[PDB]
Symmetry: D2
Subunit: 398 residues, 4 copies
């Protein structure tokens, strides 16, 4: 292992990890300096060779590293207790480069039916070009996973947990055991969880990736990807990264480094407001169903308590109406923004049906759980009383 | 007033005030855009005249305003419930331009003996050049204040509350009543308080100013000044501001706007860690004395209790030793940085005697409460446990 | 197409294109605002649907667009006279996404032996998984391009011009004609040229791509990729871009927008110095050979003369000596930095043999023109004399 | 002394001064890092004392210095060949703090009738409060300067050169001689000149100040002040600066440092385009008069030519018409923005009468040379022919 022996809490680590004990870019400043350079120089050809023969250290070129960015790399690696972390231009950049680098051509992949749409698309339209075939199972169906592990020769099992938008959870520890038994790799996307509500690496997953665009940055003002794990693995991705070059700008790395100084304070507040609002809603006449790993209704709520310490700040529920009525509800809200993304100080609402499946036919949408009813609420950091009042006032107009 | 009728808590306000309902710089973005421009253009001379005849609105020149900065102006004005707010390059810039604009040549000023040093210096070396004579009383001595208000024709009473470094408090409501009776103006520097722990304006003060470099920004990465109050008054300062031009850079205004999205979460935490640690220290056999409005041993813990809701994140205490021993203690700490300033996520420690009065003789230092013993601790946002352990471990080396 | 009818010079265009006539993000500011947002909101579900049915415009999510970035997109599109431009995280990101989006699986690609190493690697190790196969010819050998354009069906001919590090040039017009005859696509990497020294699009190329990390940004403080061309084509890449998500940060987009305000002034000076010094060196005894399209000795000086108004700021030459001696020369220089990259105000020197092929055996290096002799000089914007003096003084130590 | 012995041109200096040989903030990066911190920490009380006893170096607090800012301080000091330079929040901030720090209470000041308005106001409404009396002479009237230098005791002679908006010049060398004879101090505002077109320090002036908001930054996206001169003098201002705290933000310091990498390339084009267009304008039947030091009709063209290598990028001329007609002209232009400020890549036009004296009566305006006729043109860096075409086309509508 860990950063500091005098830092035993994730909050204290999220703050000082990668900085308090030293930075690499020496300063007597309190904060990390933003280094805007596209290249690094050498004093003499002699030293350039040293570095080339691994006798000296240097990023050499901007596509291969940056001082103000490694800090953020070491900081996250600490939280996840990972051996090494790789930062990218975005979440989709992290998932994509990782799949291309770890799954061989032709090899098999296994994921749930709740896989992030964009990623599903990439897995079903691009990856096949290399013979890579897959198996889409149910988040819960471990039997399915078990079997696929035997007929086909699975290369990697990829899944998020919680899941979007129904927040389905996966038993990281159990799933990790099965896969490794048959040699498969396990990668968990803890975007909704956060490295504070769960330690996918600790539970057995080989790699844990995030979309820092959400909770990590937490201020809805920057995109970024995340992938932590063992050097041996993460460095294989880092290589293909140096070729595809989806590098992260130092200014972005800083906005995140800064945003993580209050990761704990933020996540804590979201967790409450979330849980608390869940119950209120689930017990509302105008709310048909409510999805939240905290509720007892949740199918894997037993897994949520056994592997998570918090249940997140995202809550999905179905209003008692139709596309139009549900819409009237979200239009009635006054604090959240009707927009995509989640995890930031500002609250956000959206109808997954209209916001991300409008391109499909009502039958094709429902073909995968998405209903005109479904509403996805990302609870901000505003006052619980202010929020709740707003949600209720809105449900009344329905 | 109130920004929004659906926003009743300071936390929700600190977040959406000046943005949620509209910005002036129209966007469909969630955040405020950083506008890096030194000048604003007009479409045709016709429109330039309109503006000149107050028929159109424009900042015209950068020294007179900026889109990404008014947001922060309107945001703070909301929290303080002020009619208008003016942002500057720094805290000292705010105090200084205000004194120069509101106190006439020859006029009289009244402040406590605990007045911020730099400001005391400005009041005792610069202001006299303009005939401005001053009276220095004790923060508590309300009698002296009442006499000055009677002998001389006081122009303005300026004081911070809490005070530095002993955190002395002033009865804003009482003091405000006396002054206004004799026509004096009252300006309170709520830097240590924060617009969350108290409402200087509500209690009667005419103007409340802050040093956003501390708690408002909260990330130890930007300097800024603050002055909120009624238009009639704050606009008089704004004018002199356009001539002295200590403008605030848009990039600074944004780093603060961002920093204020978690003001409540941060202050709240800082309020605990402080009060609690204040109690442990008070009961420690190695700590000679402890200053904190939250404690009962505080001279004005009774005034602080009635006019404030929280007690700040700063705690001053005297170790049981001398310059050298006290130093050994701070050198023993492992989490805080030995440095100036306070109010940010990172904890900071300093010995006011060495850090700000080393230029004076031991006799001149003690001539105003500063002892080689005194330690000033700005509690970060790290875990209370990690913090408590560190402070104790250090006190043991003594 | 032309941006403005009142702007007839590339210099005036590089400056006002995408801004002077309007921005989309309305302001009375002179410059483009940096919009730091990860998502864009909608006023009511109604408007969200409009947008979804192409009745309204919005970027929706940050991975799909940004106000402060389109400006830079429209600005470059103007310079190249392109129908549309796409900006990415880096040069390698631009090349890579384009290849993956335009060349089908099993398809065929054709490029020169002077192809950018990293890109060659991607073409020889990654692309093959998709069944894609390539044909590597000589920059000059047009007969080969002709044969290859026949024996096997070519999907796209990709080449840079000038080339690195020998600056070989390709007859864009001729080459474009042959390919299109056999239905192949033509993509030219004008990195070294700049949209000012040549118009690959005008000469017939379908797509022209750049690495804005070099000349476009011109200050060695930001990475970025570029791809301009017809909507029909560039939009196909833009799509795969929204999945692979190697988005460009708004802060980067601005640093480049800003850097292009002096693109013309910079390229001009770099152009003169390059040429003149090119000449001086060629006559210098200690200098063996000199590569520069400007010189009369350049194999394709006629094509350079024919399709370029400028010859760039990069000059490659071989010192009279060996790895060690050549090194002693570059170590003797005092103004340039020994480092990778080029195109910025600061001059830079490097020995391609040590800096990018050290991983290969002397025999494998020479196996492709790279010699321990070869030096690559990127002329800055410093004064011509200061530079000449320095280069001569250094050549004397040899 | 000078910066580097291998850098003999102002262009090479503007680029590498304060960086090429070292920065203080150690890096292997090519550019200067932006250090966003409000405080600097110490390793142990021991070292804090060292620093306090001038045995160690540190900025201590942000109001007292910053790493990314000193670079810009050392860079400008090099250009002006000054002993030390102080950077502020704006030009007005630099002028103001300097006057308050150098002119004693009751002291006497001497300046021209063409003094920057804002500054004149400060000198005529604030300074008198401390009894600082002033003498306003004609830029040319040296006899008056000799008399005032002999009647009342002059403390400092302050003037800009060229002047605004008529660009009047002052013989720095002669004026410097007279003042120093009578002990007066000489401060020259070279804003319009630039440290490239003249060396006020070399000509004898004690202090030379600039408004980096104009030419130095050159991109119309940042405000900043400047004051260079001998340590003994500049440090006296730096002190009062630490109290009034109108500090410069590191992000601003960087935008300027970056903007100065092409100071020479930009000033060159502005120098030409200006001069040339001045002639063409004076030869036009619709232009009543033209002010430019480079013209032969300029009252001090003989002094300009003698102490200047360029004449600036600003040109003021009077159209043959009235407020309304002149307006119709500027409204007809298509490239420049109708706005305040000057010195940047984008061209700007304005009518000093409407833009800065509209508050006065026609009689009061004319009371000081400002006519409804007067137009002030700040030539950008756009192409000369695009600029000339536009100006002519507009003059035709008149
Ligand atoms: C948002 C999200 C992503 C995409 O991350 P970007 O930063 O937008 O690329 C991937 N996975 C999950 C589960 C997400 O919620
Ligand atoms: C820090 C502080 C100031 C000074 O503010 P700056 O931002 O440093 O100028 C003024 N008053 C108090 C009470 C402070 O704590
Ligand atoms: C530098 C360069 C690239 C790579 O661009 P990045 O911005 O480093 O990814 C590609 N092609 C050429 C010809 C280059 O010179
Ligand atoms: C613009 C200008 C100033 C004012 O500088 P700011 O940066 O606007 O405060 C002072 N003097 C002259 C001569 C100017 O041209």
């Amino acid at each position: 292992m860990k950063y500091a022996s005098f830092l035993n809490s994730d909050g204290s680590v999220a703050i000082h990890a990668g900085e308090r004990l030293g930075r690499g870019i020496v300063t007597d400043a309190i904060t990390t300096p933003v280094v805007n350079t596209s290249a690094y120089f050498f004093n003499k050809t002699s030293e350039l060779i040293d570095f080339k023969e691994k006798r000296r250290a240097s990023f050499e070129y901007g596509r291969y590293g940056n001082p103000t960015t490694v800090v953020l790399e070491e900081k996250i690696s600490a939280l996840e207790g990972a051996e090494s972390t790789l930062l990218m231009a975005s979440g989709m950049c992290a998932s994509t480069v990782m799949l291309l680098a770890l799954v061989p051509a032709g090899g098999h992949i296994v994921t749930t039916t709740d896989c992030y749409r964009k990623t599903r698309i990439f897995i079903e339209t691009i990856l096949p070009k290399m013979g890579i075939t897959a198996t889409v199972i149910d988040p819960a169906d471990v039997g399915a996973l078990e079997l696929a592990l035997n007929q086909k020769k699975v290369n990697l099992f990829f899944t998020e947990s919680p899941t979007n938008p129904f927040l389905r959870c996966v038993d990281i520890e159990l799933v990790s055991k099965l896969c490794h038994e048959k040699g498969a790799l396990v990668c968990i996307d803890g975007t909704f969880a956060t490295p504070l509500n769960q330690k996918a690496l600790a539970l057995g997953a080989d790699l844990v990736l995030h979309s820092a665009t959400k909770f990590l940055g937490g201020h809805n003002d920057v995109l970024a990807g995340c992938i932590s794990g063992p050097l041996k693995l993460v460095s294989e991705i880092r290589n293909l990264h140096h070729i595809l070059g989806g590098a992260l700008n130092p200014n972005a790395a800083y906005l995140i480094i800064r945003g993580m100084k209050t990761l704990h304070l933020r996540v804590q507040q979201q967790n409450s407001t979330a849980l608390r609002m869940a119950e209120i809603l689930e017990a509302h006449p105008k709310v048909r169903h409510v999805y939240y790993p905290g509720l007892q209704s949740h199918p894997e709520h037993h897994i949520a308590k056994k592997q998570m310490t918090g249940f997140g700040g995202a809550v999905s529920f179905e209003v008692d109406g139709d596309l139009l009525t549900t819409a009237k509800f979200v239009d009635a809200l006054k604090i959240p923004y009707i927009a995509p993304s989640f995890g930031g100080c500002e609250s956000i609402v959206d109808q997954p049906a209209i916001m991300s499946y409008w391109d499909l036919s009502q039958s094709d949408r429902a073909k995968y759980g998405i209903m005109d009813n479904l509403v996805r609420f990302s609870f901000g950091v505003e006052d619980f009383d202010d929020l709740k009042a707003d949600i209720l006032q809105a449900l009344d107009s329905i």
